[PDB]
Structure formats: C-alpha cells, structure tokens
PDB file of all heavy atoms in Angstrom:
ATOM      1  N   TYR A  43      32.102 147.803 181.687  1.00 25.45           N
ATOM      2  CA  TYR A  43      32.899 147.427 182.846  1.00 25.45           C
ATOM      3  C   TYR A  43      32.155 146.473 183.736  1.00 25.45           C
ATOM      4  O   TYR A  43      30.929 146.546 183.923  1.00 25.45           O
ATOM      5  CB  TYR A  43      33.310 148.679 183.672  1.00 25.45           C
ATOM      6  CG  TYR A  43      34.101 148.329 184.941  1.00 25.45           C
ATOM      7  CD1 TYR A  43      35.181 147.519 184.866  1.00 25.45           C
ATOM      8  CD2 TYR A  43      33.698 148.859 186.147  1.00 25.45           C
ATOM      9  CE1 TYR A  43      35.914 147.233 185.960  1.00 25.45           C
ATOM     10  CE2 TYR A  43      34.431 148.570 187.282  1.00 25.45           C
ATOM     11  CZ  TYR A  43      35.521 147.739 187.216  1.00 25.45           C
ATOM     12  OH  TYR A  43      36.245 147.418 188.325  1.00 25.45           O
ATOM     13  N   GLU A  44      32.893 145.491 184.309  1.00 23.99           N
ATOM     14  CA  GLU A  44      32.313 144.506 185.141  1.00 23.99           C
ATOM     15  C   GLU A  44      33.080 144.444 186.471  1.00 23.99           C
ATOM     16  O   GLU A  44      34.277 144.604 186.511  1.00 23.99           O
ATOM     17  CB  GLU A  44      32.453 143.118 184.476  1.00 23.99           C
ATOM     18  CG  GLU A  44      31.685 142.975 183.162  1.00 23.99           C
ATOM     19  CD  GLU A  44      31.884 141.641 182.474  1.00 23.99           C
ATOM     20  OE1 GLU A  44      33.070 141.324 182.144  1.00 23.99           O
ATOM     21  OE2 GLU A  44      30.908 140.867 182.341  1.00 23.99           O
ATOM     22  N   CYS A  45      32.296 144.291 187.533  1.00 27.96           N
ATOM     23  CA  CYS A  45      32.844 144.101 188.894  1.00 27.96           C
ATOM     24  C   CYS A  45      31.755 143.651 189.802  1.00 27.96           C
ATOM     25  O   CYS A  45      30.559 143.684 189.461  1.00 27.96           O
ATOM     26  CB  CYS A  45      33.483 145.408 189.374  1.00 27.96           C
ATOM     27  SG  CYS A  45      32.281 146.763 189.710  1.00 27.96           S
ATOM     28  N   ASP A  46      32.140 143.258 191.053  1.00 31.60           N
ATOM     29  CA  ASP A  46      31.234 142.830 192.027  1.00 31.60           C
ATOM     30  C   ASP A  46      30.817 144.070 192.890  1.00 31.60           C
ATOM     31  O   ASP A  46      31.656 144.938 193.139  1.00 31.60           O
ATOM     32  CB  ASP A  46      31.829 141.749 192.961  1.00 31.60           C
ATOM     33  CG  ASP A  46      32.078 140.477 192.175  1.00 31.60           C
ATOM     34  OD1 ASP A  46      31.386 140.218 191.173  1.00 31.60           O
ATOM     35  OD2 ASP A  46      32.979 139.736 192.602  1.00 31.60           O
ATOM     36  N   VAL A  47      29.554 144.071 193.313  1.00 32.19           N
ATOM     37  CA  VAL A  47      29.001 145.201 194.094  1.00 32.19           C
ATOM     38  C   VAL A  47      28.105 144.641 195.124  1.00 32.19           C
ATOM     39  O   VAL A  47      27.349 143.679 194.898  1.00 32.19           O
ATOM     40  CB  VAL A  47      28.228 146.206 193.183  1.00 32.19           C
ATOM     41  CG1 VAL A  47      27.493 147.259 193.985  1.00 32.19           C
ATOM     42  CG2 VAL A  47      29.232 146.856 192.182  1.00 32.19           C
ATOM     43  N   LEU A  48      28.138 145.234 196.306  1.00 29.05           N
ATOM     44  CA  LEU A  48      27.309 144.832 197.445  1.00 29.05           C
ATOM     45  C   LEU A  48      25.810 145.180 197.140  1.00 29.05           C
ATOM     46  O   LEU A  48      25.516 146.140 196.417  1.00 29.05           O
ATOM     47  CB  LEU A  48      27.759 145.500 198.765  1.00 29.05           C
ATOM     48  CG  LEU A  48      29.105 145.090 199.240  1.00 29.05           C
ATOM     49  CD1 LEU A  48      29.498 145.959 200.447  1.00 29.05           C
ATOM     50  CD2 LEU A  48      29.141 143.662 199.663  1.00 29.05           C
ATOM     51  N   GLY A  49      24.925 144.441 197.762  1.00 26.48           N
ATOM     52  CA  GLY A  49      23.525 144.643 197.524  1.00 26.48           C
ATOM     53  C   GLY A  49      23.032 146.057 197.965  1.00 26.48           C
ATOM     54  O   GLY A  49      22.270 146.675 197.253  1.00 26.48           O
ATOM     55  N   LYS A  50      23.569 146.505 199.095  1.00 27.88           N
ATOM     56  CA  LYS A  50      23.200 147.806 199.576  1.00 27.88           C
ATOM     57  C   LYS A  50      23.529 148.919 198.609  1.00 27.88           C
ATOM     58  O   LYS A  50      22.967 150.015 198.694  1.00 27.88           O
ATOM     59  CB  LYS A  50      23.820 148.124 200.919  1.00 27.88           C
ATOM     60  CG  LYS A  50      25.372 148.288 200.881  1.00 27.88           C
ATOM     61  CD  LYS A  50      25.952 148.661 202.263  1.00 27.88           C
ATOM     62  CE  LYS A  50      27.391 149.048 202.128  1.00 27.88           C
ATOM     63  NZ  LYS A  50      27.953 149.502 203.455  1.00 27.88           N
ATOM     64  N   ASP A  51      24.456 148.654 197.669  1.00 27.82           N
ATOM     65  CA  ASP A  51      24.897 149.634 196.667  1.00 27.82           C
ATOM     66  C   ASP A  51      24.193 149.527 195.336  1.00 27.82           C
ATOM     67  O   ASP A  51      24.647 150.118 194.364  1.00 27.82           O
ATOM     68  CB  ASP A  51      26.416 149.492 196.479  1.00 27.82           C
ATOM     69  CG  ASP A  51      27.202 150.228 197.557  1.00 27.82           C
ATOM     70  OD1 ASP A  51      26.637 151.107 198.224  1.00 27.82           O
ATOM     71  OD2 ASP A  51      28.379 149.883 197.775  1.00 27.82           O
ATOM     72  N   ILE A  52      23.078 148.764 195.297  1.00 29.26           N
ATOM     73  CA  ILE A  52      22.327 148.540 194.073  1.00 29.26           C
ATOM     74  C   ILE A  52      20.918 148.969 194.225  1.00 29.26           C
ATOM     75  O   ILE A  52      20.317 148.699 195.284  1.00 29.26           O
ATOM     76  CB  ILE A  52      22.418 147.056 193.630  1.00 29.26           C
ATOM     77  CG1 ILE A  52      23.894 146.554 193.480  1.00 29.26           C
ATOM     78  CG2 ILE A  52      21.662 146.824 192.317  1.00 29.26           C
ATOM     79  CD1 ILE A  52      24.023 145.076 193.237  1.00 29.26           C
ATOM     80  N   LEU A  53      20.400 149.655 193.257  1.00 30.38           N
ATOM     81  CA  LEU A  53      19.000 150.101 193.232  1.00 30.38           C
ATOM     82  C   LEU A  53      18.317 149.353 192.085  1.00 30.38           C
ATOM     83  O   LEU A  53      18.730 149.502 190.914  1.00 30.38           O
ATOM     84  CB  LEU A  53      18.912 151.606 193.098  1.00 30.38           C
ATOM     85  CG  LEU A  53      19.486 152.431 194.177  1.00 30.38           C
ATOM     86  CD1 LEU A  53      19.457 153.960 193.746  1.00 30.38           C
ATOM     87  CD2 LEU A  53      18.766 152.223 195.487  1.00 30.38           C
ATOM     88  N   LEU A  54      17.277 148.554 192.420  1.00 32.62           N
ATOM     89  CA  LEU A  54      16.598 147.763 191.389  1.00 32.62           C
ATOM     90  C   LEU A  54      15.575 148.699 190.672  1.00 32.62           C
ATOM     91  O   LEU A  54      14.374 148.588 190.869  1.00 32.62           O
ATOM     92  CB  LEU A  54      15.921 146.605 192.073  1.00 32.62           C
ATOM     93  CG  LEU A  54      15.421 145.468 191.179  1.00 32.62           C
ATOM     94  CD1 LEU A  54      16.562 144.861 190.333  1.00 32.62           C
ATOM     95  CD2 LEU A  54      14.765 144.345 192.057  1.00 32.62           C
ATOM     96  N   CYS A  55      16.110 149.528 189.829  1.00 33.50           N
ATOM     97  CA  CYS A  55      15.308 150.475 189.084  1.00 33.50           C
ATOM     98  C   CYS A  55      15.456 150.237 187.555  1.00 33.50           C
ATOM     99  O   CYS A  55      16.627 150.297 187.040  1.00 33.50           O
ATOM    100  CB  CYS A  55      15.679 151.919 189.421  1.00 33.50           C
ATOM    101  SG  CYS A  55      15.415 152.437 191.122  1.00 33.50           S
ATOM    102  N   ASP A  56      14.376 150.011 186.874  1.00 30.02           N
ATOM    103  CA  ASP A  56      14.411 149.877 185.411  1.00 30.02           C
ATOM    104  C   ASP A  56      13.032 150.193 184.837  1.00 30.02           C
ATOM    105  O   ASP A  56      12.151 149.317 184.787  1.00 30.02           O
ATOM    106  CB  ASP A  56      14.811 148.493 184.988  1.00 30.02           C
ATOM    107  CG  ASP A  56      14.842 148.349 183.447  1.00 30.02           C
ATOM    108  OD1 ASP A  56      14.915 149.381 182.761  1.00 30.02           O
ATOM    109  OD2 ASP A  56      14.795 147.176 182.976  1.00 30.02           O
ATOM    110  N   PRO A  57      12.768 151.438 184.408  1.00 33.21           N
ATOM    111  CA  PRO A  57      13.684 152.594 184.368  1.00 33.21           C
ATOM    112  C   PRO A  57      13.697 153.345 185.728  1.00 33.21           C
ATOM    113  O   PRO A  57      12.929 152.996 186.601  1.00 33.21           O
ATOM    114  CB  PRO A  57      13.093 153.508 183.319  1.00 33.21           C
ATOM    115  CG  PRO A  57      11.615 153.203 183.414  1.00 33.21           C
ATOM    116  CD  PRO A  57      11.479 151.774 183.777  1.00 33.21           C
ATOM    117  N   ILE A  58      14.533 154.374 185.857  1.00 34.18           N
ATOM    118  CA  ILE A  58      14.449 155.240 186.986  1.00 34.18           C
ATOM    119  C   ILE A  58      13.054 155.872 187.056  1.00 34.18           C
ATOM    120  O   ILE A  58      12.518 156.330 186.060  1.00 34.18           O
ATOM    121  CB  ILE A  58      15.519 156.369 186.919  1.00 34.18           C
ATOM    122  CG1 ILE A  58      16.935 155.733 186.886  1.00 34.18           C
ATOM    123  CG2 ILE A  58      15.403 157.336 188.100  1.00 34.18           C
ATOM    124  CD1 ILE A  58      18.047 156.673 186.556  1.00 34.18           C
ATOM    125  N   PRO A  59      12.377 155.783 188.238  1.00 32.95           N
ATOM    126  CA  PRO A  59      10.937 156.227 188.260  1.00 32.95           C
ATOM    127  C   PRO A  59      10.763 157.703 187.849  1.00 32.95           C
ATOM    128  O   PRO A  59      11.664 158.506 188.029  1.00 32.95           O
ATOM    129  CB  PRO A  59      10.572 155.982 189.706  1.00 32.95           C
ATOM    130  CG  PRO A  59      11.571 155.042 190.245  1.00 32.95           C
ATOM    131  CD  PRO A  59      12.853 155.383 189.523  1.00 32.95           C
ATOM    132  N   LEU A  60       9.597 157.956 187.374  1.00 29.67           N
ATOM    133  CA  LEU A  60       9.156 159.395 187.115  1.00 29.67           C
ATOM    134  C   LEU A  60       9.217 160.151 188.383  1.00 29.67           C
ATOM    135  O   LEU A  60       9.048 159.633 189.522  1.00 29.67           O
ATOM    136  CB  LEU A  60       7.808 159.404 186.515  1.00 29.67           C
ATOM    137  CG  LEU A  60       7.577 158.677 185.185  1.00 29.67           C
ATOM    138  CD1 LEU A  60       6.140 158.515 184.888  1.00 29.67           C
ATOM    139  CD2 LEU A  60       8.275 159.375 184.065  1.00 29.67           C
ATOM    140  N   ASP A  61       9.475 161.506 188.226  1.00 27.81           N
ATOM    141  CA  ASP A  61       9.589 162.474 189.338  1.00 27.81           C
ATOM    142  C   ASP A  61      10.829 162.255 190.133  1.00 27.81           C
ATOM    143  O   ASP A  61      11.030 162.898 191.186  1.00 27.81           O
ATOM    144  CB  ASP A  61       8.402 162.363 190.276  1.00 27.81           C
ATOM    145  CG  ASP A  61       7.113 162.733 189.579  1.00 27.81           C
ATOM    146  OD1 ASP A  61       7.161 163.587 188.613  1.00 27.81           O
ATOM    147  OD2 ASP A  61       6.018 162.209 189.935  1.00 27.81           O
ATOM    148  N   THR A  62      11.797 161.433 189.712  1.00 28.71           N
ATOM    149  CA  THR A  62      13.025 161.245 190.419  1.00 28.71           C
ATOM    150  C   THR A  62      14.018 162.354 190.046  1.00 28.71           C
ATOM    151  O   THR A  62      14.155 162.691 188.888  1.00 28.71           O
ATOM    152  CB  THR A  62      13.637 159.877 190.072  1.00 28.71           C
ATOM    153  OG1 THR A  62      12.698 158.842 190.408  1.00 28.71           O
ATOM    154  CG2 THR A  62      14.954 159.676 190.861  1.00 28.71           C
ATOM    155  N   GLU A  63      14.731 162.906 191.046  1.00 29.30           N
ATOM    156  CA  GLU A  63      15.827 163.768 190.780  1.00 29.30           C
ATOM    157  C   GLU A  63      17.084 163.018 190.390  1.00 29.30           C
ATOM    158  O   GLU A  63      17.438 162.073 191.101  1.00 29.30           O
ATOM    159  CB  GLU A  63      16.093 164.717 192.015  1.00 29.30           C
ATOM    160  CG  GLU A  63      17.246 165.684 191.758  1.00 29.30           C
ATOM    161  CD  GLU A  63      17.571 166.444 193.012  1.00 29.30           C
ATOM    162  OE1 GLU A  63      16.763 166.481 193.967  1.00 29.30           O
ATOM    163  OE2 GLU A  63      18.701 167.029 193.065  1.00 29.30           O
ATOM    164  N   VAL A  64      17.692 163.355 189.263  1.00 28.88           N
ATOM    165  CA  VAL A  64      18.777 162.646 188.701  1.00 28.88           C
ATOM    166  C   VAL A  64      19.834 163.654 188.230  1.00 28.88           C
ATOM    167  O   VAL A  64      19.657 164.846 188.292  1.00 28.88           O
ATOM    168  CB  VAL A  64      18.346 161.735 187.530  1.00 28.88           C
ATOM    169  CG1 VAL A  64      17.210 160.850 187.909  1.00 28.88           C
ATOM    170  CG2 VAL A  64      17.949 162.611 186.336  1.00 28.88           C
ATOM    171  N   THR A  65      20.976 163.105 187.801  1.00 27.87           N
ATOM    172  CA  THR A  65      22.072 163.924 187.143  1.00 27.87           C
ATOM    173  C   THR A  65      22.094 163.503 185.695  1.00 27.87           C
ATOM    174  O   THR A  65      22.337 162.288 185.387  1.00 27.87           O
ATOM    175  CB  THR A  65      23.381 163.654 187.860  1.00 27.87           C
ATOM    176  OG1 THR A  65      23.243 164.068 189.219  1.00 27.87           O
ATOM    177  CG2 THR A  65      24.467 164.490 187.207  1.00 27.87           C
ATOM    178  N   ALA A  66      21.995 164.425 184.795  1.00 27.01           N
ATOM    179  CA  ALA A  66      21.931 164.145 183.329  1.00 27.01           C
ATOM    180  C   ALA A  66      23.306 164.559 182.737  1.00 27.01           C
ATOM    181  O   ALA A  66      23.617 165.758 182.762  1.00 27.01           O
ATOM    182  CB  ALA A  66      20.777 164.857 182.682  1.00 27.01           C
ATOM    183  N   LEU A  67      24.007 163.614 182.226  1.00 28.49           N
ATOM    184  CA  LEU A  67      25.378 163.863 181.705  1.00 28.49           C
ATOM    185  C   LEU A  67      25.334 164.458 180.319  1.00 28.49           C
ATOM    186  O   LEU A  67      24.496 163.998 179.445  1.00 28.49           O
ATOM    187  CB  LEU A  67      26.204 162.607 181.728  1.00 28.49           C
ATOM    188  CG  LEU A  67      26.602 162.040 183.045  1.00 28.49           C
ATOM    189  CD1 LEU A  67      27.313 160.663 182.849  1.00 28.49           C
ATOM    190  CD2 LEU A  67      27.468 162.974 183.850  1.00 28.49           C
ATOM    191  N   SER A  68      26.164 165.443 180.028  1.00 27.28           N
ATOM    192  CA  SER A  68      26.383 165.939 178.643  1.00 27.28           C
ATOM    193  C   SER A  68      27.821 166.457 178.638  1.00 27.28           C
ATOM    194  O   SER A  68      28.481 166.646 179.654  1.00 27.28           O
ATOM    195  CB  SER A  68      25.397 167.034 178.318  1.00 27.28           C
ATOM    196  OG  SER A  68      25.397 168.159 179.215  1.00 27.28           O
ATOM    197  N   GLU A  69      28.245 166.714 177.422  1.00 26.30           N
ATOM    198  CA  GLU A  69      29.691 167.095 177.264  1.00 26.30           C
ATOM    199  C   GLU A  69      30.063 168.262 178.100  1.00 26.30           C
ATOM    200  O   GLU A  69      29.434 169.356 178.020  1.00 26.30           O
ATOM    201  CB  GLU A  69      29.945 167.391 175.769  1.00 26.30           C
ATOM    202  CG  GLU A  69      31.435 167.690 175.467  1.00 26.30           C
ATOM    203  CD  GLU A  69      31.804 167.368 173.997  1.00 26.30           C
ATOM    204  OE1 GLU A  69      31.183 166.482 173.419  1.00 26.30           O
ATOM    205  OE2 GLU A  69      32.755 167.991 173.510  1.00 26.30           O
ATOM    206  N   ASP A  70      31.047 168.044 178.977  1.00 24.00           N
ATOM    207  CA  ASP A  70      31.546 169.080 179.913  1.00 24.00           C
ATOM    208  C   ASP A  70      30.558 169.427 180.998  1.00 24.00           C
ATOM    209  O   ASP A  70      30.627 170.494 181.627  1.00 24.00           O
ATOM    210  CB  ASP A  70      31.914 170.394 179.160  1.00 24.00           C
ATOM    211  CG  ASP A  70      33.007 170.107 178.106  1.00 24.00           C
ATOM    212  OD1 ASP A  70      33.913 169.306 178.327  1.00 24.00           O
ATOM    213  OD2 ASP A  70      32.943 170.793 177.071  1.00 24.00           O
ATOM    214  N   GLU A  71      29.571 168.537 181.228  1.00 25.75           N
ATOM    215  CA  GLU A  71      28.578 168.710 182.312  1.00 25.75           C
ATOM    216  C   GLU A  71      28.555 167.416 183.128  1.00 25.75           C
ATOM    217  O   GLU A  71      28.218 166.357 182.583  1.00 25.75           O
ATOM    218  CB  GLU A  71      27.173 168.989 181.782  1.00 25.75           C
ATOM    219  CG  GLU A  71      27.117 170.293 180.952  1.00 25.75           C
ATOM    220  CD  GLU A  71      27.055 171.541 181.772  1.00 25.75           C
ATOM    221  OE1 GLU A  71      27.250 171.445 182.995  1.00 25.75           O
ATOM    222  OE2 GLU A  71      26.736 172.630 181.222  1.00 25.75           O
ATOM    223  N   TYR A  72      28.898 167.495 184.419  1.00 24.03           N
ATOM    224  CA  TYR A  72      29.038 166.328 185.309  1.00 24.03           C
ATOM    225  C   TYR A  72      28.059 166.383 186.460  1.00 24.03           C
ATOM    226  O   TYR A  72      27.884 165.347 187.137  1.00 24.03           O
ATOM    227  CB  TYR A  72      30.479 166.171 185.804  1.00 24.03           C
ATOM    228  CG  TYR A  72      31.533 166.213 184.700  1.00 24.03           C
ATOM    229  CD1 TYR A  72      32.134 167.369 184.366  1.00 24.03           C
ATOM    230  CD2 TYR A  72      31.862 165.001 184.026  1.00 24.03           C
ATOM    231  CE1 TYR A  72      33.086 167.389 183.372  1.00 24.03           C
ATOM    232  CE2 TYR A  72      32.814 165.034 183.022  1.00 24.03           C
ATOM    233  CZ  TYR A  72      33.422 166.183 182.697  1.00 24.03           C
ATOM    234  OH  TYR A  72      34.403 166.222 181.654  1.00 24.03           O
ATOM    235  N   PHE A  73      27.472 167.551 186.779  1.00 25.69           N
ATOM    236  CA  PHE A  73      26.660 167.710 187.961  1.00 25.69           C
ATOM    237  C   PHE A  73      25.277 168.320 187.618  1.00 25.69           C
ATOM    238  O   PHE A  73      24.581 168.792 188.562  1.00 25.69           O
ATOM    239  CB  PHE A  73      27.330 168.492 189.064  1.00 25.69           C
ATOM    240  CG  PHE A  73      28.797 168.141 189.175  1.00 25.69           C
ATOM    241  CD1 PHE A  73      29.754 169.039 188.842  1.00 25.69           C
ATOM    242  CD2 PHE A  73      29.197 166.932 189.749  1.00 25.69           C
ATOM    243  CE1 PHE A  73      31.108 168.720 188.910  1.00 25.69           C
ATOM    244  CE2 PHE A  73      30.514 166.642 189.955  1.00 25.69           C
ATOM    245  CZ  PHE A  73      31.466 167.519 189.504  1.00 25.69           C
ATOM    246  N   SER A  74      24.901 168.310 186.336  1.00 25.26           N
ATOM    247  CA  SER A  74      23.634 168.926 185.948  1.00 25.26           C
ATOM    248  C   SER A  74      22.463 168.065 186.446  1.00 25.26           C
ATOM    249  O   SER A  74      22.257 167.000 185.988  1.00 25.26           O
ATOM    250  CB  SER A  74      23.594 169.093 184.469  1.00 25.26           C
ATOM    251  OG  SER A  74      22.347 169.620 184.017  1.00 25.26           O
TER     252      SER A  74
END
C-alpha cells in the first residue's frame, strides 16, 4: 500500500532498536 504521511507520523527505524516494546502479529493475535 502507498500513501502520503506526515513527518511527525514516521519513525526512522531500521531495524526497530533492541529493548523496544513492540506488538508482534500472529494469526488471531492483534495486541500481543
């Protein structure tokens, strides 16, 4: 998917840093 996004809504992370709290998607899991 392509669209325009404001800078304030972008995080220049590649990869997401170690020790970061994230949400890991899996089948039927949306908030793990």
Side-chain angles (χ1 to χ4, degrees):
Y43 178 50
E44 297 175 299
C45 70
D46 295 333
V47 172
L48 295 173
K50 69 175 189 178
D51 279 339
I52 303 173
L53 298 172
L54 194 59
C55 297
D56 178 20
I58 299 170
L60 300 166
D61 297 328
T62 303
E63 181 185 342
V64 307
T65 301
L67 293 174
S68 60
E69 185 153 333
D70 302 323
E71 300 282 10
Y72 308 94
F73 318 108
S74 177

